[PDB]
Write a protein that binds this ligand. Structure first.
Ligand SMILES: Cn1c(-c2cccc(NC(=O)CCC(=O)NCc3ccc4c(c3)OCO4)c2)c(I)c2cc(C(=O)O)c(O)cc21
Length: 264
């Protein structure tokens, strides 16, 4: 893990946008930013706003795409749905609670069951909240106001059991969970990138995107194929820096992948 933490003593890519004054309070952590070449660009924003194209997120495509970004901020909730809509995403993976260890990891941006809110030009209708053990599945209807013909379902799997400290002592919950999200994403033909976030959108988020990428490998090739965790992390970090910030989260990806193979 350290042979890679060092490999980032310097960054091979530019993150000039996130620093612009106007995008200053559009990030949760001043130091965590998105590389200009992968970052999600937001079109069609309030023409009264100078910069409405920025959102702290990065398209992550294995080299099924993903979109890693931060947990919503009170002032970014509308930029968030604009991304969802613009990107045509149908699945959302919340990996953080709304407040861990007493602090705000993410702001609520989905309306209560049966309810319906409006975020800028976007409308969201929670048509039914179901809640299993490790997570809660919320069926949402997103659409741009003034145009109901654009409406589409956007399932939001909200993992809730992840410990405030450390990582799951066992990968079972994360695997059944991801397993669901996989098939759900597969059923929706022409869906956009799966979104996955957390406080900053790089640690825990990266742990999921990564585990999922490898498990997809094990579904296509078998339990025999070769898994290179370290080459994979570098692979995503080239699209978004910091993916996976701890050794424990690193070891998890390993225990995660093996376990899955055991299951098979
Ligand atoms: C572990 N970690 C860290 C991360 C990395 C380095 C340091 C910290 N620091 C801490 O606050 C822990 C300190 C502690 O012992 N508590 C006492 C305490 C807490 C809050 C207070 C306070 C005192 O005084 C005022 O406030 C967190 C990140 I960033 C991070 C991000 C993710 C992700 O998915 O995005 C993740 O899954 C894990 C992550």
């Amino acid at each position: 893990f350290e042979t890679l933490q060092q490999q980032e003593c310097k960054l091979l890519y530019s993150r000039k946008e996130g620093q612009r004054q106007e995008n200053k309070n559009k990030n949760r952590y001043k130091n965590i930013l998105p590389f200009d070449h992968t970052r999600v660009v937001l079109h069609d924003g309030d023409p009264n706003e100078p910069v409405s194209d920025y959102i702290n997120a990065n398209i992550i495509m294995p080299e099924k795409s993903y979109i890693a970004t931060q947990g919503c901020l009170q002032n970014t909730v509308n930029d968030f749905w604009r991304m969802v809509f613009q990107e045509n995403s149908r699945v959302i993976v919340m990996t953080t609670k709304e407040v861990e260890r007493g602090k705000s990891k993410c702001v609520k941006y989905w309306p209560d069951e049966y309810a319906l809110k409006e975020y800028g030009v976007m409308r969201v209708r929670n048509v039914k909240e179901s809640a299993a053990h490790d997570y809660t599945l919320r069926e949402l209807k997103l659409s741009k106001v003034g145009q109901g013909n654009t409406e589409r379902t956007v399932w939001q799997y909200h993992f809730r059991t992840w410990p405030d400290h450390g990582v799951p002592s066992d990968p079972g919950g994360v695997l059944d969970f991801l397993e669901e999200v996989h098939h759900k994403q597969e059923s929706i033909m022409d869906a956009g990138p799966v979104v996955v976030h957390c406080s900053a959108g790089i640690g825990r988020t990266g742990t999921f995107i990564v585990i999922d990428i490898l498990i997809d490998i094990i579904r296509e090739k078998g339990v025999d194929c070769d898994i290179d965790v370290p080459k994979t992390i570098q692979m995503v970090r080239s699209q978004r820096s910091g993916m996976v910030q701890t050794e424990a989260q690193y070891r998890f990806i390993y225990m995660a992948v093996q376990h899955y193979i055991e299951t098979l």
